[PDB]
């Protein structure tokens, strides 16, 4: 039996640190896909 918080497992990511990284990464993709373009992120499509 589970004795404690009734919860589902969870993963924490700091909003500031991920964003800062994202901004630096998204600029690197534009060294290929061109200086100006729209880059959108989305979760997994589907599968196993």
């Amino acid at each position: 039996d589970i004795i404690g918080d009734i919860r589902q497992a969870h993963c924490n990511v700091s909003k500031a640190t991920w964003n800062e990284t994202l901004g630096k990464v998204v600029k690197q993709l534009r060294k290929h896909f061109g200086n100006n373009t729209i880059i959108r992120f989305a979760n997994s499509s589907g599968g196993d």
Partner: antibody
Amino acid sequence: PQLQESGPTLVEASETLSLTCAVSGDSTAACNSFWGWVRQPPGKGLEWVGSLSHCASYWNRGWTYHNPSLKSRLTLALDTPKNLVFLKLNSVTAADTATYYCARFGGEVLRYTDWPKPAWVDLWGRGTLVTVSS
Amino acid sequence: LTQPPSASGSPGQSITISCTGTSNNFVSWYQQHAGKAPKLVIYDVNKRPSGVPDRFSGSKSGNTASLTVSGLQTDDEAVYYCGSLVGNWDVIFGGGTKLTVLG
């Protein structure tokens, strides 16, 4: 399950009041209930003192609850191997004179959300009277 | 919590004592005989504990909590306190209601 209170029945003012509860028939290690005290002044109502428990979570080594007014002057302690409860009151006055009961707190202790939520005393002790005189 | 100072009734009659200030369901009532230790007669509102007669029933409507004792008898004469959890983990008690079933 039996709770036996023990300690000085007569304490002088401004001194340190110490009381010890001896549990019988149950383990203090059990995460099903909290252990603490409830004092009842002579011919007056029931007042909550405090309770604690070593059964902790990932960010703490335990839980300890103090009554906001009595917080400064009290210290709560639990002996897990020896199955004993402790209460220490610093700078005691004649206003603190009461019949002290060893209390077991029930509630959302075995399955809680966020912090544990003890709400009622299921098992009481016989209690002892401590009179504070200067 | 505000508990009525007194309450009286004849044997066999039913008494209902109230309590207010309870916004949650953690309400509980206690019975303390004079010169004795308090005993919990009810918990989690309506729910009863072991060795407690059916005639004891808890109830809570809105901000008001209520205890009901039917079929009064000699052993029911005592002081009745109510208590409940508030906020995060603190708990408070009412002034208590003194119910007498004397002859």
